[PDB]
Amino acid sequence: CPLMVKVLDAVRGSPAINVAVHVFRKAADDTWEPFASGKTSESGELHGLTTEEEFVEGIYKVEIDTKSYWKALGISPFHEHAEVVFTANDSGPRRYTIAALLSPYSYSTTAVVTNP
Amino acid sequence: CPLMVKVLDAVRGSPAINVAVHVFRKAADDTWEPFASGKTSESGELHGLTTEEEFVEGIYKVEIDTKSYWKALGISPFHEHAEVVFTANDRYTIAALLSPYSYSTTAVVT
Amino acid sequence: CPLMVKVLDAVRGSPAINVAVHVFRKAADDTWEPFASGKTSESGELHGLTTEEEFVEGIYKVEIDTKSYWKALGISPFHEHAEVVFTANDRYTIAALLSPYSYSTTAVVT
Amino acid sequence: CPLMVKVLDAVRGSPAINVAVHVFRKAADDTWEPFASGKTSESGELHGLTTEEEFVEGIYKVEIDTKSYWKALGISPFHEHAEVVFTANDSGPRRYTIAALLSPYSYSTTAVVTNP
Numbered sequence: 001c002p003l004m005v006k007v008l009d010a011v012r013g014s015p016a017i018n019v020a021v022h023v024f025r026k027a028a029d030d031t032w033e034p035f036a037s038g039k040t041s042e043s044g045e046l047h048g049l050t051t052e053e054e055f056v057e058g059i060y061k062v063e064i065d066t067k068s069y070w071k072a073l074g075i076s077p078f079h080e081h082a083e084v085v086f087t088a089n090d091s092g093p094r095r096y097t098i099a100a101l102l103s104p105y106s107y108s109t110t111a112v113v114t115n116p
Numbered sequence: 117c118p119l120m121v122k123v124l125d126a127v128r129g130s131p132a133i134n135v136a137v138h139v140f141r142k143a144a145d146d147t148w149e150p151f152a153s154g155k156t157s158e159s160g161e162l163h164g165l166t167t168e169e170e171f172v173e174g175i176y177k178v179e180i181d182t183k184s185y186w187k188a189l190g191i192s193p194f195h196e197h198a199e200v201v202f203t204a205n206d207r208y209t210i211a212a213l214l215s216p217y218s219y220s221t222t223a224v225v226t
Numbered sequence: 227c228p229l230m231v232k233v234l235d236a237v238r239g240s241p242a243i244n245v246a247v248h249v250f251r252k253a254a255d256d257t258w259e260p261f262a263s264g265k266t267s268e269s270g271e272l273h274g275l276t277t278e279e280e281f282v283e284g285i286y287k288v289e290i291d292t293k294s295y296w297k298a299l300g301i302s303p304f305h306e307h308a309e310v311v312f313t314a315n316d317r318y319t320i321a322a323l324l325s326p327y328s329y330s331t332t333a334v335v336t
Numbered sequence: 337c338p339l340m341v342k343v344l345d346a347v348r349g350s351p352a353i354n355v356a357v358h359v360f361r362k363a364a365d366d367t368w369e370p371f372a373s374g375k376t377s378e379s380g381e382l383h384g385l386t387t388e389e390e391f392v393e394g395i396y397k398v399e400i401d402t403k404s405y406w407k408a409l410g411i412s413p414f415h416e417h418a419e420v421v422f423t424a425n426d427s428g429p430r431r432y433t434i435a436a437l438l439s440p441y442s443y444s445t446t447a448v449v450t451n452p
């Protein structure tokens with residue numbers, strides 16, 4: 001799994017479950033093209049987005065649907081989403097974990113990049 | 117003063133100075149219209165972006181050029197930028213704390 | 227103004243108002259001597275804690291009473307408090323962003 | 337494992353490896369007593385601190401030695417440590433993950449609490 005996403009909820013102290021995640025890749029023409037999508041599991045983790053073959057060099061955007069997450073819990077959140085945009089695999093293939101921690105008016109994100 | 121951006125550096129323990137910030141408003145065709153821009157000051161703050169009459173309800177995007185910031189300090193960064201997207205509903209401070217492989221953002225709405 | 231504390235609320239998107247803050251300095255016997263205290267203001271800030279002559283080099287602890295803060299809002303919190311411990315070496319802002327099960331802290335030293 | 341600690345490095349985008357962690361429990365007399373200690377692994381994780389039998393109700397303090405971590409990397413950090421202090425198991429046994437994200441002048445911490 002060269003790309004994994006993990007989401008936590010800072011209000012409840014829990015994994016953020018059933019969070020939709022959409023991944024895009026910048027095309028030659030500078031537009032965002034769909035790349036992969038999925039939803040977090042009961043552990044707040046999303047595996048299986050992509051493969052070593054499909055996850056080529058490029059500029060990727062990981063868009064985490066924070067707004068729907070909070071709205072489902074009955075809460076009115078501030079942000080439309082949380083996005084992470086980065087260049088991947090420039091110096092050869094790497095594994096990337098994008099982690100996010102969510103509150104209604106705030107989020108943080110970190111990347112863990114490892115060399116297979 | 118309806119909209120202010122404040123940027124902090126978690127590596128140096130300082131304001132993030134001379135950070136480029138561009139603000140956009142979402143247009144009816146779902147594209148992003150330029151709205152405001154500037155560079156953070158010596159205090160890491162960017163004031164004077166808009167006025168009450170100009171800042172209508174809508175979806176706004178604050179694009180912070182974190183990559184140029186880190187490169188100007190000689191530090192290797194992960195992100196292309198940090199973009200913060202929110203709805204304004206009828207004073208907003210967008211605050212960001214930057215590290216090379218992470219960022220945090222909060223809204224202070226008073 | 228050598229020492230300021232600023233507290234923000236990530237749930238409400240606001241300053242964290244009326245938060246109790248106690249500052250201590252580490253004594254030669256490794257116990258903690260009271261140094262300063264106060265409650266954050268309407269802006270989430272606590273100024274006027276010390277003076278330049280009083281704030282000598284040493285190890286300082288800033289204890290923020292996050293549990294009382296959350297309970298006064300009717301919200302169930304994880305932590306007993308948030309304590310931030312650092313060395314002052316010859317202006318410091320200790321900033322904290324609070325959530326019920328998490329907190330973040332940074333130092334702005336100028 | 338009722339108590340786990342995970343540490344990440346926000347500068348390098350990596351697990352924070354070889355971080356010392358000391359856990360204390362408040363005694364009857366209101367002092368901190370040693371409870372357990374260990375160091376993070378190559379994954380930035382510390383397992384095996386305690387057991388279901390030993391991890392009784394109480395007020396616990398998890399002290400993460402951030403200062404030594406940065407100093408070993410040749411960096412002068414701001415904080416002496418990062419601590420997390422919480423009441424555990426008050427409404428019955430729970431599993432607790434304390435996660436921390438480190439930068440030289442900043443840290444964040446979150447708790448993930450689950451019901452076995």
Ligand SMILES: Cc1nnc(-c2ccnc3ccccc23)[nH]1
Nearest residue numbers: 006099101108109110435437444
């Ligand atoms: C998953 C996961 N493992 N550690 C974290 C984490 C902890 C503290 N602060 C954060 C801020 C941003 C993203 C993750 C984190 N998340």
Ligand SMILES: Cc1nnc(-c2ccnc3ccccc23)[nH]1
Nearest residue numbers: 211213220321322323330331332
């Ligand atoms: C002052 C001041 N205005 N914003 C912070 C802030 C913003 C985002 N994330 C955080 C994480 C930790 C501490 C402060 C912050 N500090």
Ligand SMILES: [Ca+2]
Nearest residue numbers: 057089090091
């Ligand atoms: Ca290349």
Ligand SMILES: [Ca+2]
Nearest residue numbers: 393425426427
């Ligand atoms: Ca009990």
